[PDB]
Design a protein around this ligand. Structure first.
Ligand SMILES: CC(C)(C)[C@@H](O)C(=O)NS(=O)(=O)OC[C@H]1O[C@@H](n2cnc3c(N)ncnc32)[C@H](O)[C@@H]1O
Ligand SMILES: CC(C)(C)[C@@H](O)C(=O)NS(=O)(=O)OC[C@H]1O[C@@H](n2cnc3c(N)ncnc32)[C@H](O)[C@@H]1O
Lengths: 286, 279
């Protein structure tokens, strides 16, 4: 056990350090909350932090780790935004007591050896062109969960497929953690907050409102049925200058091997220049 | 409410949630939870693991009995439970397949490359099944220590890889192989051997022990000694005979290693392995 000062941000890099502190905290009755991130923190991440913080007796651990395993080769890893100074400043301002900032060597001392193989969902949507991406995500989240052993772990609805996959991980491996989904944080015009939004120039930023406009239009059109919802979204995306749609799909809420009934999720991915944006929304049919 | 637990009696649980709750409750009361994963049909080899678990001060012993479809096998539940009662084991965990896999096979563990080697030759998905079910059992029971036999050495090493790679907070304890009077490693498969096969089967252990003593003369002497012993036996189809380092990487020039053999006698496949010190 190393030093933990309450009411202050404590930064630990060694997995053993945070594990020891987490264990000590949990044994004195504090409930440990985990918020996994890759840093470059914005208000969307802070929504998860605040959700963690309101759990009574909670101590909040925010992990910051840009996980190489979930990146495909081709510059994405090097290009991921890194603003560590701002990140830690934001955590202090939010009254977070623990930041976990491990090294790549500490997380992957043996390279890729034992890993998590996700179910068939990982091959679809985001995983279509990136068939190893979610194995990266599930592997690192499993490790983080084992290191920190939180009572609850927090994920954004922003990455809805990721959230679904984490619930599968938790169910399928009998993990003793509650997964808390947190609603998507949006800019004033509807644009879902993302560390990638910084790559939109003013014109592309203008056009990007089309993703959330399309989804919200769909959600209201859905009283008229699925075809109406999808065609409303398509019309909006089609009206938008320089938006190239990768996919627009309406699925059951579990995204799994079940047909759409009363409750669905509409998911979109689109490119604005080289920037790929995602958004999704709850859809109720009829 | 925590499920009923009767100290000093064998308490049997089939629901994962029940064993999980009892385990958590017990650890809070100052017990150290010991897990011994098995597939039932228990013999003295399995009981050696039980006895290792039992001697830890403060122990409560959890023996799981579960035939993992992912990795007909003998099934004697009444008899198994009686053996555990006779050993003073307080918890048996006996889940159904549906309880262990309520959503079928979905998220699984993918082992590292060692899983494709040795036993993974004939059964390239076997260790994925093993690591998946062991990970689940570890998360359900959350033991302080988990016990595995040196009998399945490759399994044991792979479980150490699992634990290190996923940052699992459990100590893995390897338990020495229990052997019949002539050296044959104990296994439920031994009873399938006919008299001539059973007599020939002694060559696996004889070959390994000969090798371990021949090892003062170096690695090649150790291997040649083992091959000679196996070559003296009729009807023993050697699948592999390999000297590796203790983590089953390539054998160093000197130091500690493991010699592993597998062979087929008729339709029965037998395994054995032994510690080797080179020079
Ligand atoms: C292995 C990790 C799970 C750490 C990685 O894959 C990851 O997603 N990293 S992340 O830094 O991009 O996001 C961290 C968490 O913040 C969530 N998040 C992001 N933007 C928003 C938003 N606008 N509103 C609500 N929630 C949001 C996101 O869904 C995720 O759960
Ligand atoms: C997923 C499981 C780990 C439950 C499964 O793969 C398995 O190995 N099941 S098992 O019933 O075949 O073995 C249970 C345990 O007993 C151990 N074992 C068996 N025979 C001996 C022996 N003769 N001497 C010492 N130890 C022995 C074996 O290595 C394993 O750790």
């Amino acid at each position: 056990i190393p030093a933990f000062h309450p009411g202050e941000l404590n930064v630990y890099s060694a997995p053993g350090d945070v594990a020891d502190v987490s264990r000590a905290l949990r044994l004195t009755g504090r409930r440990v909350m985990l918020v996994p991130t890759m840093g470059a923190l914005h208000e969307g991440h802070l929504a998860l932090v605040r959700a963690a913080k309101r759990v009574p007796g909670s101590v909040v651990v925010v992990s910051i780790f840009v996980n190489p395993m979930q990146f495909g080769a081709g510059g994405d890893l090097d290009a991921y935004p890194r603003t560590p100074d701002d990140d830690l400043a934001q955590l202090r301002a939010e009254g977070v007591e623990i930041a976990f900032t491990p090294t790549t060597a500490a997380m992957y001392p043996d390279g890729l050896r034992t890993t998590v193989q996700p179910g068939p969902l990982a091959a679809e949507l985001e995983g279509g062109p990136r068939p190893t991406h979610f194995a990266g995500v599930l592997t690192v989240v499993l490790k983080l969960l084992q290191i920190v052993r939180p009572d609850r772990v927090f994920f954004g609805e922003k990455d809805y497929q990721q959230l679904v996959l984490i619930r599968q991980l938790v169910a399928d491996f009998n993990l003793d953690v509650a997964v808390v989904g947190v609603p998507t944080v949006r800019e004033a015009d509807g644009l879902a907050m993302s560390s990638r939004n910084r790559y939109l120039d003013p014109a592309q930023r203008a056009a990007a409102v089309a993703l959330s406009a399309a989804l919200t239009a769909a959600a209201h059109a859905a009283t008229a049925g699925a075809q109406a919802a999808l065609d409303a979204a398509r019309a909006v995306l089609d009206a938008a200058p320089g938006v190239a749609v990768d996919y627009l799909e309406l699925r059951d809420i579990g995204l799994g091997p079940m047909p759409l009934n009363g409750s669905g999720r509409l998911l979109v991915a689109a490119r604005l220049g080289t920037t790929r944006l995602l958004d999704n929304i709850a859809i109720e049919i009829g």
